[PDB]
Design a protein around this ligand. Sequence first.
Ligand SMILES: NC(=O)C1=CN([C@@H]2O[C@H](COP(=O)(O)OP(=O)(O)OC[C@H]3O[C@@H](n4cnc5c(N)ncnc54)[C@H](OP(=O)(O)O)[C@@H]3O)[C@@H](O)[C@H]2O)C=CC1
Ligand SMILES: NC(=O)C1=CN([C@@H]2O[C@H](COP(=O)(O)OP(=O)(O)OC[C@H]3O[C@@H](n4cnc5c(N)ncnc54)[C@H](OP(=O)(O)O)[C@@H]3O)[C@@H](O)[C@H]2O)C=CC1
Ligand SMILES: COc1ccccc1-c1nc(N)nc(N)c1C#CC1CC1
Ligand SMILES: COc1ccccc1-c1nc(N)nc(N)c1C#CC1CC1
Ligand SMILES: [Co+2]
Ligand SMILES: [Co+2]
Lengths: 159, 159
Amino acid sequence: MVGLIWAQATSGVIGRGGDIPWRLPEDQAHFREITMGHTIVMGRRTWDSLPAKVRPLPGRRNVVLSRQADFMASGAEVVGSLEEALTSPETWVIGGGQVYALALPYATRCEVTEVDIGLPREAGDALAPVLDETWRGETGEWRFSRSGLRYRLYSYHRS
Amino acid sequence: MVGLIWAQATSGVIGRGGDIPWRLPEDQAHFREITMGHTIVMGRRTWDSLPAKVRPLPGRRNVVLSRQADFMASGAEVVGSLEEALTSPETWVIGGGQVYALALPYATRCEVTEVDIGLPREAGDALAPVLDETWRGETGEWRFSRSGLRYRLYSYHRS
Ligand SMILES: NC(=O)C1=CN([C@@H]2O[C@H](COP(=O)(O)OP(=O)(O)OC[C@H]3O[C@@H](n4cnc5c(N)ncnc54)[C@H](OP(=O)(O)O)[C@@H]3O)[C@@H](O)[C@H]2O)C=CC1
Ligand SMILES: NC(=O)C1=CN([C@@H]2O[C@H](COP(=O)(O)OP(=O)(O)OC[C@H]3O[C@@H](n4cnc5c(N)ncnc54)[C@H](OP(=O)(O)O)[C@@H]3O)[C@@H](O)[C@H]2O)C=CC1
Ligand SMILES: COc1ccccc1-c1nc(N)nc(N)c1C#CC1CC1
Ligand SMILES: COc1ccccc1-c1nc(N)nc(N)c1C#CC1CC1
Ligand SMILES: [Co+2]
Ligand SMILES: [Co+2]
């Protein structure tokens, strides 16, 4: 099972300037719960952006996707194609924008957090992938966060 | 991944008299979506509850749990233990009450439909399993079924 998991502003923005333009602790706990124990696949840019302190993510098989054949991600497996990353019963693709779009055709689930920030799309932003008709989704109720922000969870599935 | 999927009254009743005391087309559609393509495991009593006619459920590996070594389930596999049924990336336990209880220690997902029907628990009823503190649950909004009963979907997960 290949799933994607991401957190986006309502506008689709997931990233800017190499970082995240918000903080939502509840989303981090949700992300941890969904990925824990499983393989996680990230793009090289996302790996670089993480402080070495939080890297690799505990309890998960960390895989970094890079076009650099001898790239070394200390504490992670480096692979040159998504297919090499996709063993194990359950793999979660955890960003960023380029790798979500690459992985979506392989995916059967998307777990999406929507953050109610009015954040406009800007040139250069990382964006969430666009989900076609084949994605049936269940809207969660609007939760409320200790950061003061309103957010909502979507569980998308297909086939 | 082993998931449980069930529909319950608010009281926890999931079955009565070998059948179900309601019928929501919206829940049947959600059940089909979540299970399609995967292994589905059901107790022998639940297989008996299916008319020959809709058995086995199409597009899914139908597995029936029975202690009867001679029991025939035309269109399905009949296994004597639950562990024999776990050779697929996604396995959905689809009932009934005894198999839910037996499968729960293997489960990381519960997809629950709560039906807003006041249904006192009678002797002989089959009940939903009790979810302890290890389970983290998404709730959705209460929705109107065309049968006139409200319902809502819970997605529970634990690592
Ligand atoms: N949920 C969220 O909100 C999340 C947001 N983010 C954000 O996303 C942003 C980064 O995303 P983005 O810039 O798109 O980068 P990615 O993280 O998607 O990394 C892109 C890199 O992937 C590598 N790669 C290897 N093989 C391929 C391939 N076949 N196709 C494409 N890429 C390949 C390349 O690395 P190389 O150059 O080495 O070859 C490429 O530079 C940051 O702002 C980050 O904070 C990240 C995670 C989650
Ligand atoms: N979502 C919902 O609301 C659902 C409701 N239901 C309802 O649930 C009810 C049936 O549930 P229930 O009565 O609990 O019966 P089950 O469907 O759970 O079947 C129980 C049978 O499974 C077999 N079995 C049980 N435990 C084991 C084991 N450890 N090893 C091997 N075989 C085992 C036995 O079969 P054998 O006797 O052959 O040995 C036992 O008789 C019906 O009302 C049905 O309509 C059913 C599914 C979904
Ligand atoms: C902005 O989101 C977060 C902010 C802090 C911590 C985790 C998340 C997060 N959340 C969801 N829902 N999906 C995700 N892929 C991620 C991620 C990631 C890569 C850095 C490893
Ligand atoms: C009252 O439930 C239903 C009624 C008709 C069709 C499907 C369902 C259903 N729904 C949820 N949500 N979970 C489930 N396990 C099931 C089931 C089943 C076994 C008979 C095959
Ligand atoms: Co599926
Ligand atoms: Co898991």
